[PDB]
Short mmCIF file of C-alpha atoms and ligand atoms in Angstrom, two decimals:
data_model
loop_
_atom_site.label_atom_id
_atom_site.label_comp_id
_atom_site.label_asym_id
_atom_site.label_seq_id
_atom_site.Cartn_x
_atom_site.Cartn_y
_atom_site.Cartn_z
CA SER A 34 -47.36 33.93 -37.91
CA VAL A 35 -45.60 36.81 -36.13
CA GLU A 36 -46.13 40.59 -36.09
CA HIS A 37 -44.20 43.07 -38.27
CA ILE A 38 -43.13 46.26 -36.56
CA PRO A 39 -41.59 49.62 -37.52
CA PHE A 40 -37.84 49.30 -37.77
CA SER A 41 -35.96 51.69 -35.55
CA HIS A 42 -32.69 53.01 -36.90
CA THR A 43 -29.74 54.92 -35.52
CA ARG A 44 -28.44 57.30 -38.21
CA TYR A 45 -25.32 59.56 -38.09
CA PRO A 46 -24.65 62.83 -39.97
CA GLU A 47 -22.58 61.95 -43.08
CA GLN A 48 -19.27 63.26 -41.84
CA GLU A 49 -19.55 61.09 -38.77
CA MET A 50 -20.51 58.14 -40.94
CA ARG A 51 -17.33 58.73 -42.87
CA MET A 52 -15.22 58.89 -39.72
CA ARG A 53 -16.91 55.86 -38.10
CA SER A 54 -16.46 53.73 -41.22
CA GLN A 55 -12.80 54.73 -41.44
CA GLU A 56 -12.03 54.09 -37.76
CA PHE A 57 -13.79 50.74 -37.87
CA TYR A 58 -11.75 49.74 -40.92
CA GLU A 59 -8.57 50.86 -39.14
CA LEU A 60 -9.50 48.88 -36.06
CA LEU A 61 -10.29 45.66 -37.95
CA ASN A 62 -7.20 46.12 -40.09
CA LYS A 63 -5.11 45.72 -36.97
CA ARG A 64 -6.65 42.25 -36.30
CA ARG A 65 -4.05 39.54 -36.92
CA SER A 66 -4.33 35.85 -36.21
CA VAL A 67 -2.20 35.37 -33.07
CA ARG A 68 -0.67 31.98 -32.27
CA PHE A 69 1.13 33.01 -29.07
CA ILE A 70 -1.33 33.71 -26.32
CA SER A 71 -0.80 34.64 -22.72
CA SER A 72 -2.33 32.69 -19.81
CA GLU A 73 -3.37 36.00 -18.26
CA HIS A 74 -6.95 36.17 -16.99
CA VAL A 75 -9.59 37.87 -19.08
CA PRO A 76 -12.91 39.08 -17.63
CA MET A 77 -15.70 36.63 -18.25
CA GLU A 78 -18.03 39.60 -18.78
CA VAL A 79 -16.04 40.44 -21.93
CA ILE A 80 -16.12 36.81 -23.11
CA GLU A 81 -19.90 36.89 -22.67
CA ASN A 82 -20.27 40.16 -24.55
CA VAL A 83 -18.29 38.80 -27.49
CA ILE A 84 -20.47 35.68 -27.58
CA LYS A 85 -23.60 37.83 -27.28
CA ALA A 86 -22.30 39.91 -30.22
CA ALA A 87 -21.81 36.74 -32.32
CA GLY A 88 -25.33 35.72 -31.48
CA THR A 89 -26.72 38.89 -33.17
CA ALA A 90 -25.83 37.45 -36.61
CA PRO A 91 -28.42 37.00 -39.26
CA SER A 92 -29.21 33.35 -40.03
CA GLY A 93 -31.10 31.51 -42.77
CA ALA A 94 -34.84 31.78 -42.06
CA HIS A 95 -34.06 32.91 -38.47
CA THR A 96 -32.71 29.55 -37.29
CA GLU A 97 -29.73 30.75 -35.18
CA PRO A 98 -27.95 27.42 -35.76
CA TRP A 99 -24.94 27.98 -33.49
CA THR A 100 -23.53 26.70 -30.21
CA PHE A 101 -20.56 28.45 -28.56
CA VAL A 102 -18.88 25.98 -26.27
CA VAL A 103 -16.66 27.78 -23.74
CA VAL A 104 -13.72 25.98 -22.12
CA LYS A 105 -11.78 27.43 -19.20
CA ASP A 106 -11.04 24.21 -17.28
CA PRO A 107 -7.30 23.37 -17.54
CA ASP A 108 -7.90 19.59 -17.64
CA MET A 109 -10.50 19.95 -20.32
CA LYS A 110 -8.32 22.37 -22.35
CA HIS A 111 -5.36 19.94 -22.22
CA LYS A 112 -7.62 17.07 -23.28
CA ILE A 113 -8.63 19.24 -26.23
CA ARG A 114 -4.96 19.95 -26.94
CA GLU A 115 -3.98 16.31 -27.11
CA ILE A 116 -6.77 15.38 -29.44
CA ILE A 117 -5.90 18.20 -31.80
CA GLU A 118 -2.13 17.69 -31.76
CA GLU A 119 -2.71 13.98 -32.40
CA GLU A 120 -4.98 14.58 -35.39
CA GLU A 121 -2.90 17.51 -36.74
CA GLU A 122 0.23 15.41 -36.69
CA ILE A 123 -1.46 12.90 -38.96
CA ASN A 124 -2.69 15.88 -40.96
CA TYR A 125 0.80 17.29 -41.60
CA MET A 126 2.41 13.90 -42.08
CA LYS A 127 -0.17 12.53 -44.46
CA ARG A 128 -3.78 13.72 -44.67
CA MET A 129 -3.44 17.30 -45.90
CA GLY A 130 -1.08 16.35 -48.72
CA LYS A 131 2.09 17.97 -50.06
CA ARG A 132 0.43 20.97 -51.69
CA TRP A 133 -1.43 22.11 -48.55
CA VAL A 134 1.69 21.43 -46.43
CA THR A 135 3.76 23.58 -48.77
CA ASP A 136 0.96 26.17 -48.69
CA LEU A 137 1.33 26.39 -44.88
CA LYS A 138 5.13 26.78 -44.79
CA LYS A 139 4.85 30.57 -44.82
CA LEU A 140 2.90 30.44 -41.52
CA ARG A 141 5.37 28.14 -39.65
CA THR A 142 2.49 26.22 -38.16
CA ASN A 143 2.95 22.57 -37.13
CA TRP A 144 0.99 20.04 -35.07
CA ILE A 145 1.99 21.35 -31.66
CA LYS A 146 -0.51 23.86 -30.28
CA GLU A 147 0.71 25.36 -27.00
CA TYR A 148 -2.02 28.01 -27.11
CA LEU A 149 -4.66 25.40 -26.42
CA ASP A 150 -3.20 25.18 -22.91
CA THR A 151 -1.96 28.71 -22.36
CA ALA A 152 -4.97 30.66 -23.61
CA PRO A 153 -7.25 31.21 -20.60
CA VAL A 154 -10.39 30.59 -22.65
CA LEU A 155 -11.19 28.44 -25.68
CA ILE A 156 -14.28 29.09 -27.75
CA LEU A 157 -15.41 26.18 -29.96
CA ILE A 158 -17.99 27.30 -32.48
CA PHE A 159 -20.39 24.48 -33.35
CA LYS A 160 -22.83 24.65 -36.25
CA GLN A 161 -26.12 22.82 -35.88
CA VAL A 162 -26.59 21.12 -39.29
CA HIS A 163 -30.26 20.89 -38.46
CA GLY A 164 -32.24 21.71 -35.33
CA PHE A 165 -35.20 20.46 -33.30
CA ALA A 166 -38.43 22.20 -32.44
CA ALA A 167 -39.91 21.99 -28.95
CA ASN A 168 -42.15 19.07 -29.96
CA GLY A 169 -38.96 17.28 -31.05
CA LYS A 170 -39.58 17.54 -34.77
CA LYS A 171 -36.56 18.26 -36.94
CA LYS A 172 -36.07 21.74 -38.32
CA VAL A 173 -34.03 22.60 -41.38
CA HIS A 174 -31.16 25.03 -40.84
CA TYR A 175 -30.91 26.75 -44.23
CA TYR A 176 -27.31 27.80 -45.04
CA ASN A 177 -26.24 26.90 -41.54
CA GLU A 178 -22.54 26.88 -42.35
CA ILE A 179 -22.58 30.36 -43.91
CA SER A 180 -24.85 31.57 -41.07
CA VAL A 181 -22.46 30.29 -38.39
CA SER A 182 -19.42 31.65 -40.26
CA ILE A 183 -21.03 35.09 -40.32
CA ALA A 184 -21.55 34.80 -36.55
CA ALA A 185 -17.86 33.79 -36.21
CA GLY A 186 -16.99 36.91 -38.17
CA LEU A 187 -18.94 39.07 -35.74
CA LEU A 188 -17.18 37.25 -32.91
CA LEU A 189 -13.82 37.98 -34.47
CA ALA A 190 -14.77 41.64 -34.78
CA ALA A 191 -15.92 41.74 -31.17
CA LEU A 192 -12.63 40.26 -29.95
CA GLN A 193 -10.58 42.90 -31.83
CA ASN A 194 -12.90 45.61 -30.54
CA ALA A 195 -12.34 44.50 -26.92
CA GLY A 196 -8.58 44.28 -27.35
CA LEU A 197 -8.41 40.46 -27.40
CA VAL A 198 -6.60 38.21 -29.89
CA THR A 199 -7.18 34.76 -31.32
CA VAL A 200 -6.45 32.58 -34.30
CA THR A 201 -9.29 31.01 -36.29
CA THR A 202 -8.45 27.33 -36.47
CA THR A 203 -9.90 24.31 -38.27
CA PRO A 204 -8.64 21.16 -36.55
CA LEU A 205 -9.30 18.83 -39.42
CA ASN A 206 -10.51 15.33 -38.37
CA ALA A 207 -10.65 16.36 -34.66
CA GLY A 208 -14.35 17.19 -34.93
CA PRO A 209 -15.85 13.87 -33.95
CA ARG A 210 -13.51 13.36 -30.95
CA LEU A 211 -14.10 16.92 -29.77
CA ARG A 212 -17.88 16.52 -30.11
CA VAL A 213 -17.79 13.43 -27.89
CA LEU A 214 -15.30 14.90 -25.37
CA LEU A 215 -17.42 18.00 -24.99
CA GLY A 216 -20.78 16.16 -24.85
CA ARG A 217 -22.26 17.80 -27.92
CA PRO A 218 -25.01 16.16 -29.93
CA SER A 219 -24.57 14.34 -33.22
CA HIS A 220 -26.19 17.15 -35.26
CA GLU A 221 -23.58 19.61 -34.03
CA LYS A 222 -20.29 19.90 -35.93
CA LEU A 223 -17.22 21.89 -34.88
CA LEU A 224 -16.72 24.72 -37.38
CA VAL A 225 -13.73 26.67 -35.95
CA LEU A 226 -11.91 26.75 -32.60
CA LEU A 227 -10.87 30.14 -31.21
CA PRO A 228 -8.30 30.32 -28.43
CA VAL A 229 -8.80 33.66 -26.68
CA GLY A 230 -6.67 35.91 -24.53
CA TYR A 231 -4.04 38.57 -24.70
CA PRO A 232 -1.03 38.13 -26.97
CA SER A 233 2.19 36.87 -25.37
CA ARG A 234 4.75 39.60 -24.86
CA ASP A 235 6.90 37.65 -27.37
CA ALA A 236 4.10 37.05 -29.97
CA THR A 237 4.99 37.27 -33.65
CA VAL A 238 2.91 37.13 -36.81
CA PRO A 239 3.94 36.39 -40.39
CA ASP A 240 4.64 39.61 -42.31
CA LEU A 241 1.64 39.00 -44.61
CA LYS A 242 0.01 41.86 -46.56
CA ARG A 243 -3.64 42.25 -47.51
CA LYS A 244 -4.84 42.93 -51.04
CA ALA A 245 -5.29 46.51 -52.32
CA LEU A 246 -8.87 47.76 -52.61
CA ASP A 247 -8.64 47.52 -56.37
CA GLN A 248 -7.84 43.82 -55.92
CA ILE A 249 -11.01 42.90 -54.05
CA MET A 250 -13.53 45.47 -55.27
CA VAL A 251 -14.97 45.68 -58.78
CA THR A 252 -17.46 48.28 -59.88
CA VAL A 253 -19.77 47.39 -62.72
CA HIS A 254 -21.34 49.85 -65.22
CA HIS A 255 -23.06 49.45 -68.65
CA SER B 34 9.22 32.03 -47.25
CA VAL B 35 8.24 35.31 -45.54
CA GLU B 36 9.48 37.10 -42.40
CA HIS B 37 7.86 36.84 -38.95
CA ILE B 38 7.58 40.07 -37.03
CA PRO B 39 6.62 41.22 -33.52
CA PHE B 40 2.86 41.55 -33.28
CA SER B 41 1.72 44.98 -32.17
CA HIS B 42 -1.36 45.11 -30.00
CA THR B 43 -3.75 47.77 -28.80
CA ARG B 44 -4.84 46.91 -25.23
CA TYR B 45 -7.43 48.74 -23.05
CA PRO B 46 -7.67 48.89 -19.23
CA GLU B 47 -10.17 46.21 -18.13
CA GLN B 48 -13.03 48.55 -17.31
CA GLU B 49 -12.84 50.04 -20.76
CA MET B 50 -12.71 46.55 -22.26
CA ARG B 51 -15.92 45.80 -20.40
CA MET B 52 -17.60 48.96 -21.67
CA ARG B 53 -16.35 48.52 -25.25
CA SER B 54 -17.53 44.89 -25.41
CA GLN B 55 -20.94 45.88 -24.03
CA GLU B 56 -21.43 48.84 -26.39
CA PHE B 57 -20.35 46.77 -29.39
CA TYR B 58 -22.84 44.06 -28.43
CA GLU B 59 -25.55 46.75 -28.08
CA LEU B 60 -24.67 48.19 -31.46
CA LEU B 61 -24.73 44.83 -33.26
CA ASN B 62 -27.89 43.83 -31.46
CA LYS B 63 -29.67 46.69 -33.18
CA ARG B 64 -28.76 45.27 -36.62
CA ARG B 65 -31.86 43.88 -38.34
CA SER B 66 -32.21 42.60 -41.86
CA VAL B 67 -34.06 45.42 -43.66
CA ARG B 68 -36.12 44.72 -46.79
CA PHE B 69 -37.32 48.27 -47.41
CA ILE B 70 -34.48 50.48 -48.48
CA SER B 71 -34.42 54.11 -49.52
CA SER B 72 -33.00 55.31 -52.85
CA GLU B 73 -31.19 58.08 -50.96
CA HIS B 74 -27.52 58.56 -51.82
CA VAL B 75 -24.85 57.12 -49.60
CA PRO B 76 -21.23 58.32 -49.69
CA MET B 77 -19.03 56.04 -51.74
CA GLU B 78 -16.25 56.63 -49.19
CA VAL B 79 -18.37 54.76 -46.63
CA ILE B 80 -19.11 51.94 -49.11
CA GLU B 81 -15.36 51.62 -49.69
CA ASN B 82 -14.61 51.58 -45.96
CA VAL B 83 -17.10 48.79 -45.38
CA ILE B 84 -15.58 46.78 -48.23
CA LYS B 85 -12.09 47.48 -46.86
CA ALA B 86 -13.29 46.27 -43.45
CA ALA B 87 -14.57 43.02 -45.02
CA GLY B 88 -11.22 42.58 -46.70
CA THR B 89 -9.44 42.42 -43.30
CA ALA B 90 -10.98 38.96 -42.62
CA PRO B 91 -8.82 35.97 -41.87
CA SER B 92 -8.82 33.39 -44.66
CA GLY B 93 -7.62 29.80 -45.00
CA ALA B 94 -3.86 29.82 -45.56
CA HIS B 95 -4.01 33.57 -46.38
CA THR B 96 -5.83 33.21 -49.71
CA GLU B 97 -8.28 36.13 -49.44
CA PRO B 98 -10.72 34.33 -51.77
CA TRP B 99 -13.32 37.08 -52.16
CA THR B 100 -14.56 39.51 -54.80
CA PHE B 101 -16.97 42.35 -53.85
CA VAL B 102 -18.81 43.38 -56.97
CA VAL B 103 -20.37 46.85 -56.50
CA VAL B 104 -23.37 47.86 -58.59
CA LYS B 105 -24.70 51.42 -58.62
CA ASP B 106 -25.84 51.64 -62.28
CA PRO B 107 -29.68 51.69 -62.44
CA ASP B 108 -29.84 49.63 -65.66
CA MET B 109 -27.50 47.05 -64.26
CA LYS B 110 -29.40 46.91 -60.92
CA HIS B 111 -32.73 46.40 -62.75
CA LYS B 112 -31.18 43.65 -64.86
CA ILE B 113 -30.10 42.02 -61.60
CA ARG B 114 -33.62 42.48 -60.22
CA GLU B 115 -35.30 40.70 -63.10
CA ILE B 116 -32.98 37.75 -63.02
CA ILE B 117 -33.55 37.33 -59.30
CA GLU B 118 -37.33 37.78 -59.33
CA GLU B 119 -37.55 35.32 -62.20
CA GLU B 120 -35.53 32.67 -60.39
CA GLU B 121 -37.15 33.37 -56.99
CA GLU B 122 -40.60 32.96 -58.47
CA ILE B 123 -39.68 29.45 -59.59
CA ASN B 124 -38.13 29.00 -56.17
CA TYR B 125 -41.34 29.81 -54.24
CA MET B 126 -43.59 28.04 -56.72
CA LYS B 127 -41.61 24.83 -56.89
CA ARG B 128 -37.88 24.58 -56.17
CA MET B 129 -37.64 25.38 -52.46
CA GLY B 130 -40.41 22.95 -51.52
CA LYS B 131 -43.36 23.22 -49.14
CA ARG B 132 -41.36 23.02 -45.91
CA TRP B 133 -38.99 25.90 -46.79
CA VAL B 134 -41.92 27.94 -48.15
CA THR B 135 -43.79 27.41 -44.88
CA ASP B 136 -40.57 28.23 -43.00
CA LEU B 137 -40.47 31.65 -44.76
CA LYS B 138 -44.11 32.64 -44.07
CA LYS B 139 -43.11 34.46 -40.88
CA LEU B 140 -40.87 36.80 -42.91
CA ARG B 141 -43.51 37.69 -45.57
CA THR B 142 -40.92 37.49 -48.29
CA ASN B 143 -41.96 36.62 -51.85
CA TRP B 144 -40.30 36.75 -55.29
CA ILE B 145 -40.63 40.48 -55.85
CA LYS B 146 -37.59 42.43 -54.70
CA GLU B 147 -38.13 46.17 -54.97
CA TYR B 148 -34.97 46.90 -52.97
CA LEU B 149 -32.82 45.67 -55.83
CA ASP B 150 -33.93 48.80 -57.69
CA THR B 151 -34.41 51.24 -54.83
CA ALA B 152 -31.22 50.60 -52.87
CA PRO B 153 -28.57 53.00 -54.20
CA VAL B 154 -25.86 50.33 -54.01
CA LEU B 155 -25.79 46.56 -54.35
CA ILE B 156 -22.87 44.54 -53.08
CA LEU B 157 -22.59 40.99 -54.49
CA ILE B 158 -20.11 38.93 -52.53
CA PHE B 159 -18.39 36.35 -54.73
CA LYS B 160 -16.31 33.51 -53.33
CA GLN B 161 -13.38 32.29 -55.42
CA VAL B 162 -13.62 28.48 -55.14
CA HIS B 163 -10.01 28.36 -56.19
CA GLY B 164 -7.59 31.06 -57.33
CA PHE B 165 -4.69 31.57 -59.74
CA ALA B 166 -1.13 32.57 -59.07
CA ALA B 167 0.65 35.14 -61.20
CA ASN B 168 2.16 32.40 -63.41
CA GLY B 169 -1.40 31.19 -64.02
CA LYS B 170 -1.14 28.05 -61.93
CA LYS B 171 -4.19 27.14 -59.87
CA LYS B 172 -4.14 27.78 -56.16
CA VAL B 173 -6.31 26.02 -53.60
CA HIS B 174 -8.61 28.22 -51.53
CA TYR B 175 -8.87 26.26 -48.28
CA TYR B 176 -12.26 26.76 -46.58
CA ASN B 177 -13.11 29.50 -49.04
CA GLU B 178 -16.82 29.49 -48.23
CA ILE B 179 -16.27 29.88 -44.49
CA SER B 180 -13.54 32.48 -45.18
CA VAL B 181 -15.82 34.55 -47.40
CA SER B 182 -18.74 34.21 -44.97
CA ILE B 183 -16.54 35.56 -42.18
CA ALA B 184 -15.63 38.51 -44.42
CA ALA B 185 -19.39 39.03 -45.07
CA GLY B 186 -19.85 39.04 -41.30
CA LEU B 187 -17.32 41.84 -40.94
CA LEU B 188 -19.07 43.65 -43.78
CA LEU B 189 -22.37 43.32 -41.97
CA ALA B 190 -20.79 44.69 -38.79
CA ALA B 191 -19.23 47.59 -40.71
CA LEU B 192 -22.58 48.51 -42.25
CA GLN B 193 -24.32 48.62 -38.82
CA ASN B 194 -21.39 50.61 -37.43
CA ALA B 195 -21.77 53.24 -40.20
CA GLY B 196 -25.53 53.46 -39.76
CA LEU B 197 -26.43 51.58 -42.96
CA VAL B 198 -28.87 48.69 -43.37
CA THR B 199 -29.14 45.68 -45.65
CA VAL B 200 -30.58 42.21 -45.85
CA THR B 201 -28.30 39.19 -46.45
CA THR B 202 -29.83 37.39 -49.42
CA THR B 203 -29.19 34.07 -51.17
CA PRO B 204 -30.85 34.21 -54.61
CA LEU B 205 -30.95 30.49 -55.17
CA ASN B 206 -30.33 29.45 -58.81
CA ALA B 207 -29.60 33.08 -59.86
CA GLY B 208 -25.84 32.57 -59.41
CA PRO B 209 -24.90 31.47 -62.90
CA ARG B 210 -26.95 34.18 -64.65
CA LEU B 211 -25.59 36.82 -62.29
CA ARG B 212 -21.98 35.71 -62.81
CA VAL B 213 -22.46 36.02 -66.61
CA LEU B 214 -24.31 39.34 -66.44
CA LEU B 215 -21.63 40.81 -64.22
CA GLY B 216 -18.68 39.33 -66.20
CA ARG B 217 -17.28 37.27 -63.40
CA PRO B 218 -15.10 34.24 -64.06
CA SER B 219 -16.25 30.65 -63.84
CA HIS B 220 -14.34 30.02 -60.56
CA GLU B 221 -16.27 32.77 -58.85
CA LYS B 222 -19.64 31.92 -57.25
CA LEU B 223 -22.16 34.35 -55.77
CA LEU B 224 -22.35 33.75 -52.03
CA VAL B 225 -24.75 36.50 -50.81
CA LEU B 226 -26.18 39.72 -52.25
CA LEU B 227 -26.40 42.78 -50.01
CA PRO B 228 -28.56 45.72 -51.01
CA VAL B 229 -27.23 48.75 -49.14
CA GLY B 230 -28.70 52.06 -48.11
CA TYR B 231 -30.75 53.76 -45.48
CA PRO B 232 -34.02 52.19 -44.37
CA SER B 233 -37.24 53.52 -45.90
CA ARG B 234 -39.15 55.81 -43.59
CA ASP B 235 -41.87 53.11 -43.72
CA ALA B 236 -39.54 50.07 -43.20
CA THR B 237 -40.78 47.25 -40.98
CA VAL B 238 -39.12 44.09 -39.68
CA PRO B 239 -40.63 40.89 -38.36
CA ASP B 240 -40.92 40.98 -34.56
CA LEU B 241 -38.37 38.16 -34.17
CA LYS B 242 -36.42 37.62 -30.92
CA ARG B 243 -32.89 36.31 -30.49
CA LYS B 244 -31.96 33.44 -28.22
CA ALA B 245 -30.99 34.05 -24.58
CA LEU B 246 -27.29 33.73 -23.74
CA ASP B 247 -27.97 30.45 -21.97
CA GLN B 248 -29.42 29.17 -25.25
CA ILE B 249 -26.28 29.69 -27.35
CA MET B 250 -23.48 29.44 -24.77
CA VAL B 251 -22.39 26.31 -22.97
CA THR B 252 -19.61 26.19 -20.44
CA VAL B 253 -17.82 22.91 -19.98
CA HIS B 254 -16.10 21.70 -16.76
C1 FMN C 301 -27.15 32.50 -45.15
C2 FMN C 301 -28.29 33.47 -45.04
C3 FMN C 301 -29.14 33.55 -46.13
C4 FMN C 301 -30.20 34.46 -46.10
N1 FMN C 301 -30.99 34.55 -47.21
C5 FMN C 301 -32.02 35.43 -47.22
C6 FMN C 301 -32.79 35.54 -48.37
O1 FMN C 301 -32.55 34.86 -49.36
N2 FMN C 301 -33.81 36.43 -48.38
C7 FMN C 301 -34.07 37.21 -47.28
O2 FMN C 301 -35.01 37.99 -47.35
N3 FMN C 301 -33.33 37.10 -46.13
C8 FMN C 301 -32.29 36.22 -46.11
N4 FMN C 301 -31.50 36.14 -45.00
C9 FMN C 301 -31.82 37.02 -43.83
C10 FMN C 301 -32.54 36.23 -42.70
O3 FMN C 301 -33.88 35.89 -43.05
C11 FMN C 301 -32.52 37.01 -41.38
O4 FMN C 301 -31.19 37.16 -40.95
C12 FMN C 301 -33.38 36.31 -40.28
O5 FMN C 301 -34.74 36.34 -40.57
C13 FMN C 301 -33.23 36.95 -38.91
O6 FMN C 301 -33.47 38.33 -39.04
P1 FMN C 301 -32.41 39.48 -38.61
O7 FMN C 301 -31.24 39.50 -39.59
O8 FMN C 301 -33.08 40.84 -38.63
O9 FMN C 301 -31.89 39.24 -37.23
C14 FMN C 301 -30.43 35.26 -44.99
C15 FMN C 301 -29.58 35.16 -43.87
C16 FMN C 301 -28.52 34.26 -43.90
C17 FMN C 301 -27.64 34.17 -42.71
C1 FMN C 302 -11.58 29.02 -42.43
C2 FMN C 302 -10.26 29.43 -41.84
C3 FMN C 302 -9.52 28.42 -41.28
C4 FMN C 302 -8.32 28.70 -40.67
N1 FMN C 302 -7.66 27.65 -40.11
C5 FMN C 302 -6.47 27.85 -39.46
C6 FMN C 302 -5.86 26.76 -38.86
O1 FMN C 302 -6.38 25.63 -38.89
N2 FMN C 302 -4.67 26.96 -38.23
C7 FMN C 302 -4.11 28.21 -38.18
O2 FMN C 302 -3.04 28.32 -37.60
N3 FMN C 302 -4.71 29.30 -38.79
C8 FMN C 302 -5.92 29.12 -39.42
N4 FMN C 302 -6.57 30.18 -40.02
C9 FMN C 302 -5.94 31.53 -39.94
C10 FMN C 302 -5.25 31.95 -41.25
O3 FMN C 302 -4.04 31.24 -41.52
C11 FMN C 302 -5.00 33.47 -41.23
O4 FMN C 302 -6.23 34.13 -41.14
C12 FMN C 302 -4.22 33.94 -42.48
O5 FMN C 302 -2.93 33.42 -42.47
C13 FMN C 302 -4.08 35.45 -42.60
O6 FMN C 302 -3.63 35.94 -41.35
P1 FMN C 302 -4.38 37.08 -40.53
O7 FMN C 302 -5.61 36.46 -39.88
O8 FMN C 302 -3.49 37.60 -39.42
O9 FMN C 302 -4.83 38.17 -41.42
C14 FMN C 302 -7.80 29.98 -40.64
C15 FMN C 302 -8.54 31.03 -41.23
C16 FMN C 302 -9.77 30.74 -41.83
C17 FMN C 302 -10.56 31.83 -42.46
N1 IYR C 303 -34.20 33.87 -51.17
C1 IYR C 303 -35.64 34.01 -51.05
C2 IYR C 303 -36.14 33.19 -49.91
C3 IYR C 303 -35.52 33.32 -48.54
C4 IYR C 303 -35.85 34.39 -47.74
C5 IYR C 303 -35.35 34.54 -46.45
C6 IYR C 303 -34.49 33.60 -45.94
O1 IYR C 303 -34.02 33.77 -44.66
C7 IYR C 303 -34.15 32.52 -46.74
I1 IYR C 303 -32.83 31.04 -46.02
C8 IYR C 303 -34.66 32.37 -48.04
C9 IYR C 303 -36.03 35.41 -50.81
O2 IYR C 303 -35.10 36.28 -50.92
O3 IYR C 303 -37.26 35.72 -50.54
N1 IYR C 304 -5.09 23.28 -38.94
C1 IYR C 304 -3.65 23.19 -39.07
C2 IYR C 304 -3.19 23.63 -40.42
C3 IYR C 304 -3.60 24.97 -40.96
C4 IYR C 304 -2.98 26.12 -40.50
C5 IYR C 304 -3.28 27.39 -40.98
C6 IYR C 304 -4.25 27.50 -41.96
O1 IYR C 304 -4.54 28.74 -42.46
C7 IYR C 304 -4.89 26.35 -42.43
I1 IYR C 304 -6.36 26.49 -43.94
C8 IYR C 304 -4.57 25.09 -41.94
C9 IYR C 304 -2.95 24.00 -38.05
O2 IYR C 304 -3.65 24.59 -37.18
O3 IYR C 304 -1.66 24.07 -38.07
#
């Protein structure tokens, strides 16, 4: 159907591979989810580059099932805020349940989300649960959720790389209202919302620790 | 429950932010899924650094619901190969269906997977659909699949950054046999399998193109 071509690869000497892999780990390790974000301007060129980076993700059968909806308009951001705070309040009060609520205590999150106003840019990542071809026939988006999550991962990496912060959020039950507000089609579903900017001078994060290597990696012999 | 501490941030001057974001895009853009992988040795230090990088992912309510199972043993890799080829053959013949099969023609994939033997290292990413606390009580892993996929994304980025290649694979219906072979617990499920190494001198990729920016980005006023 399409042509297959020689793959062109950039290879480093081993020592540099070692250093690169270490530095990249050290860089990503400094990524923390930040819930206090400055209103300070960020260059749209950088925002575009991080979205381009996300778009380089692999996807099931090459379907690229993602839409990155960018919101900079203050009225639109605030509209987004109110929807989310409204739904999250019901979430904390009742819909998540006691266990989940208890599970969140360590993070000190609640239903008020100031960052949705203060962050200069919001990125809403929509997955396309199926697509359409040019003739208007439906196309299957194999593993679209995983594919879009991988893209989101790349996006997260690209933000850290560029010196920006965010917090990956899942505004449970806000999806349908957000879809309508933002004029997205019925086959798109909000996956995560990323408020983007610099951290506030007064930003804090929970003193969480990541697992040791021997807690996430298992090597298997015979 | 735990303490909240000042967040420490590394910030660049804007111009450098621009250049960094561009270079990182250009680096990731050169990532392609590679299905022809050399048996040449790769430093385990690098493999560990890419797994460490994956492990830095955010996760729902801080649950880190992932297990990276590393396989270098040739017997064990071959065992993995046979399970997958066996299941994939049924997949192409019958289980995926005509539409999916047609959808894969452009990639020229079939049920034979030489890379599972030739790649010096296989990484099987397992999601923990729920976890256990130290007392043995069950813990909920909120959005574990998304959380693990995001980790996989970071892993993919880390591989490209270190000059390694792979192909993200989903060996449909091979999950249960693979979990048993590899001694993983019942609450772990194989998400993707990544064969890792250098590309074969003769590696090819389909001449696919990515969407234009204006095809993935929408700005809303
Ligand atoms: C969720 C997911 C599942 C995939 N499963 C397979 C697979 O089973 N076999 C395979 O050969 N490639 C698989 N791929 C790789 C895609 O076919 C590949 O990303 C796509 O063709 C675009 O190519 P690229 O990664 O070089 O940009 C998968 C990718 C994703 C995101
Ligand atoms: C799928 C997913 C959903 C998340 N949803 C939220 C959310 O709705 N609200 C929030 O404040 N943080 C959310 N987070 C962020 C996590 O709480 C955070 O990643 C975790 O506490 C560990 O913190 P760290 O990112 O700084 O390592 C989410 C993370 C993931 C992976
Ligand atoms: N897992 C099979 C088929 C396959 C292949 C590529 C792809 O993007 C998808 I979604 C499925 C295989 O490995 O051939
Ligand atoms: N979405 C809610 C609750 C929440 C918060 C953090 C988190 O890791 C998870 I999973 C859920 C909120 O944003 O507060």
